[PDB]
Curated annotation (Swiss-Prot), chain B:
This is Small ribosomal subunit protein mS33. Keywords: Acetylation, Mitochondrion, Ribonucleoprotein, Ribosomal protein. Its main location: mitochondrion. Belongs to the mitochondrion-specific ribosomal protein mS33 family. It is found in: Mitochondrion. GO terms for cellular component: mitochondrial inner membrane; mitochondrial small ribosomal subunit; mitochondrion. The chain holds residues 5 to 90 of 106 of the full protein. One of its GO terms (biological process) is mitochondrial translation. The gene is MRPS33. It comes from Homo sapiens. It comes from the Eukaryota.
Swiss-Prot record, chain D:
PPR repeats lie at residues 18-49, 50-77. It is found in: Mitochondrion. Mitochondrial RNA-binding protein that has a role in mitochondrial translation. It comes from the Eukaryota. Belongs to the mitochondrion-specific ribosomal protein mS39 family. The gene is PTCD3. It is linked to Combined oxidative phosphorylation deficiency 51: An autosomal recessive, mitochondrial disorder characterized by intrauterine growth retardation, low birth weight, poor overall growth, progressive limb rigidity, delayed psychomotor development, hearing loss, and optic atrophy. Brain imaging shows abnormal bilateral signs at the basal ganglia and brainstem. Patient cells show decreased mitochondrial complex I and IV levels and activities, and generalized mitochondrial translation defects. This is Small ribosomal subunit protein mS39. Transmembrane segments: none annotated. Component of the mitochondrial small ribosomal subunit (mt-SSU). Mature mammalian 55S mitochondrial ribosomes consist of a small (28S) and a large (39S) subunit. The 28S small subunit contains a 12S ribosomal RNA (12S mt-rRNA) and 30 different proteins. The 39S large subunit contains a 16S rRNA (16S mt-rRNA), a copy of mitochondrial valine transfer RNA (mt-tRNA(Val)), which plays an integral structural role, and 52 different proteins. Associated with the 12S mitochondrial rRNA (12S mt-rRNA).
Swiss-Prot record, chain G:
GO terms for molecular function: RNA binding; structural constituent of ribosome. This is Small ribosomal subunit protein mS35. The keyword Ribosomal protein applies. It comes from the Eukaryota. Component of the mitochondrial small ribosomal subunit (mt-SSU). Mature mammalian 55S mitochondrial ribosomes consist of a small (28S) and a large (39S) subunit. The 28S small subunit contains a 12S ribosomal RNA (12S mt-rRNA) and 30 different proteins. The 39S large subunit contains a 16S rRNA (16S mt-rRNA), a copy of mitochondrial valine transfer RNA (mt-tRNA(Val)), which plays an integral structural role, and 52 different proteins. Keywords: Coiled coil, Mitochondrion, Ribonucleoprotein, Ribosomal protein, Transit peptide. Belongs to the mitochondrion-specific ribosomal protein mS35 family. The chain holds residues 49 to 243 of 323 of the full protein. It is found in: Mitochondrion. GO terms for cellular component: cytosol; mitochondrial inner membrane; mitochondrial small ribosomal subunit; mitochondrion. GO terms for biological process: mitochondrial translation. The gene is MRPS35.
From Swiss-Prot, chain H:
The keyword Iron does not apply. Keywords: Mitochondrion, Ribonucleoprotein, Ribosomal protein. The gene is MRPS10. Transmembrane segments: none annotated. This is Small ribosomal subunit protein uS10m. GO terms for cellular component: mitochondrial inner membrane; mitochondrial matrix; mitochondrial small ribosomal subunit; mitochondrion. The keyword Ribosomal protein applies. The lineage of its organism: Eukaryota, Metazoa, Chordata, Craniata, Vertebrata. Component of the mitochondrial small ribosomal subunit (mt-SSU). Mature mammalian 55S mitochondrial ribosomes consist of a small (28S) and a large (39S) subunit. The 28S small subunit contains a 12S ribosomal RNA (12S mt-rRNA) and 30 different proteins. The 39S large subunit contains a 16S rRNA (16S mt-rRNA), a copy of mitochondrial valine transfer RNA (mt-tRNA(Val)), which plays an integral structural role, and 52 different proteins. The chain holds residues 52 to 184 of 201 of the full protein. It is found in: Mitochondrion. GO terms for biological process: mitochondrial translation.
Amino acid sequence: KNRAARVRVSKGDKPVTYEEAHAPHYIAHRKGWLSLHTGNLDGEDHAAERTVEDVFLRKFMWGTFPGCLADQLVLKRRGNQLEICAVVLRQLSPHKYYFLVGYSETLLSYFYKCPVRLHLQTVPSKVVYKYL
Amino acid sequence: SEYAFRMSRLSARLFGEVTRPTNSKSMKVVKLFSELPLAKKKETYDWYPNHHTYAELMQTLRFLGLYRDEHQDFMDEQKRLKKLRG
Amino acid sequence: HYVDWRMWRDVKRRKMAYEYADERLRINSLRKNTILPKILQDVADEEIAALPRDSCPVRIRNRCVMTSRPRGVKRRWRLSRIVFRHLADHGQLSGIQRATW
Amino acid sequence: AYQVHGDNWKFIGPDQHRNFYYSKFFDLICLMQIDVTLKWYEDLIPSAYSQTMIHLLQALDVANRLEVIPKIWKDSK
Amino acid sequence: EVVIPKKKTWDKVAVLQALASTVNRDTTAVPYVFQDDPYLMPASSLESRSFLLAKKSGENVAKFIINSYPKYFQKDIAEPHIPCLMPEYFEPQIKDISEAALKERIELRKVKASVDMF
Amino acid sequence: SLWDVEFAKQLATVNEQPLQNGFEELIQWTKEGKLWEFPINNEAGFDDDGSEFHEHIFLEKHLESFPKQGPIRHFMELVTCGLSKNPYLSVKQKVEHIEWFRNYFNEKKDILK
Amino acid sequence: RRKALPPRTEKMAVDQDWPSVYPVAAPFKPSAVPLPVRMGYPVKKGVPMAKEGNLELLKIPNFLHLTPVAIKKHCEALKDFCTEWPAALDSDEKCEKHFPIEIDSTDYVSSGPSVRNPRARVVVLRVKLSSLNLDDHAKKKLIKLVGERYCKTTDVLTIKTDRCPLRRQNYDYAVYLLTVLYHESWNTEEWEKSK
Amino acid sequence: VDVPKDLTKPVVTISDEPDILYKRLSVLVKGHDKAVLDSYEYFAVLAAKELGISIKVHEPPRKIERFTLLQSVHIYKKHRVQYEMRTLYRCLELEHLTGSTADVYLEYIQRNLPEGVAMEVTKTQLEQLPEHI
Ligand SMILES: [Mg+2]
């Protein structure tokens, strides 16, 4: 009996997402990686910094877009340029959405001394894979 | 052989290393001054970015009122409860 | 706002070792050299002995960054085994697969 | 209008001037067949932004192309 | 005897100018500054104005935070040092009439100039 | 000059307009230079002030104030060898190393044994 | 309260410039993409997740951009600028005759904010001595001096340069080293004559 | 209907210095997704053959590194967990390639990278002999 990044089977009243449902040993078999960089590859370096500041990015953006997201993020770092992809709901106003978009993008760029971009996908209700 | 000894001398003069003979305790000097010590290597200098910076920024931004930090919310809620209950 | 006072001490040790890195190597070479005078070797010996504490790179420890666990930490990622397993299961990091070979 | 239409598109600038320009442009194009006009329009509607639609409606009326007005109203809505 | 093609020199932006001139403007698509999803899709002139103005206001907020707390972003982690990304310094130095006068044209205000004339 | 700079900046503010292409965004990023410079030489900048390989390696000019026989000569030859072998630090740091060694054995010149 | 307009699927026509609507690399944006492509493990009596909430499609790298049409267009565009290789240089023996001295550097490219990496400094070079020295004493002297930098099976001498951090410094040092090596192999000594 | 009249072409200058002659552009792309690498190398070879240069393809072996961590926290030594980083190589070699062609091609490819990939360039160019020799 192992407990690792997996949801307990309940009576059947727990909507779950794809990755939130599937186990951590199918990350390559039936899932994709949340992040894509080369520090893990051989010969590269600074992978520790990559991971640490990626965790920081995830936490900061999760807490500066609270209650709107419904899934984990997608990182995409091509050379210099950084890209983040998110999914959110449409309860708040596009005014606030764009204001926070610009604010967060500027903060990330000024902090990392790096060109950054961020995209969001709107949803009326978070997509559920199964009822667990 | 003296011929090979002088060949090595010439090769050392050409490629930079010492022509004169030298012990291992003496080549310690050259290899130390070639290789950088861990004391100044970046792997030791920057073991991680500063929680000073991180926590100060996040606290200041909380005070701005943009990052709803659930963790400190729970913490100071329990703190209010404790100071109410004595 | 480091995790704990032991992390604080380790970071101070790293600071000292860095800001006296070159000089320590210089005098250590002056000590371990062989042909120079033994009196000079001893001079450099008491010099290193009088150098302050927390200045050597031997007292430092490659501790963890987040949970500050000294053991079970990989040099490359700098993370503890526990946090590494956590992120590997949650798929946070990139291009790591379970070795079901 | 076609004559007035390299990197000389920077001189538009403010949204107010861009609005006036596009409004008068589409108005002249409507009050000029109108198949090419509606082609240009259905091409630039997402990029582009009441009076213009009124001119469009009267142009479609004089054209007698009844089948087109529904889609235009649906796009405006 | 031997033929050799001659060398040429390009601007870093010229290649991308070529790549851009290669492709025409996107058809039936809002400006690139605006997002792509339909909910955030600005569907009117006034609301689009307000939207990109909110974005500019966020930019100004970023300027304010950086010039209020420069020490946080002081770290030059990026290998190429960029003053556009470095924090901004409108801080008068210690009392020094000559250096203060030289700094007048740097600070771009009027109270410093009144005090210096005084 | 200054008033022509005011004129130029206001002209630029008149020119600036919203882009409509990711290629235009890339053009802007390259304009400010934050976007990396292809081909990646890994050395666009950090030229070491036009230093030279012989300036790095040949320390014979920096070695003048001691004969060519003594143990100080031996040690400083080993030093210069290691310095030339090390690429990471530049001629500046090499010169500071040499100067500190000079100061060291000149303040401990009392022996010469 | 607010409601989102329907996607661009019905709006986009079958005749369409995909290289124009996707000039650069970008996310999948299913709302703009008309294709019903789905990806995901289907449940028994089920199917993969629809493109709307399909986030693993975003997880994976994206290649809708740079279609074959876009590639053809960009190649036809940039052929205006590409140059031609000399037709005289069409064989290894001919090109090594024209320019014997081979030299090659190398470096990685990786994602991240920083770009410097010390491996940029190392370079290597190669030259065959069968045609360059033009004499016997000097070549015997050179092959005696060099310890392992020679290869007589393929008959090419190869040497690396890594002592300098700068690529151009490595280059200049290698050139000067080869020059001084030739000038020092030219002459000889009495202890070398006595063997 | 909107069809631009004058397409802005960048300026170009053919300087007096002769262009450099690259002889082997041997690129080695390391990644994780074999399909991504296949698409990328197809893209590369297609662009190369449309620009009018020679090409060749071959796939070096897969390299894997695994290391064992403790499955549990406090005391369980028999029960461990394993991991593996798989790197896949793909090589592409180009011969007899002019310097400016190299410039344009490397700009194109370096802008057209995907995210989770590394790439090592090895450039071999022949040159004449010095004058001091
Ligand atoms: Mg078990």
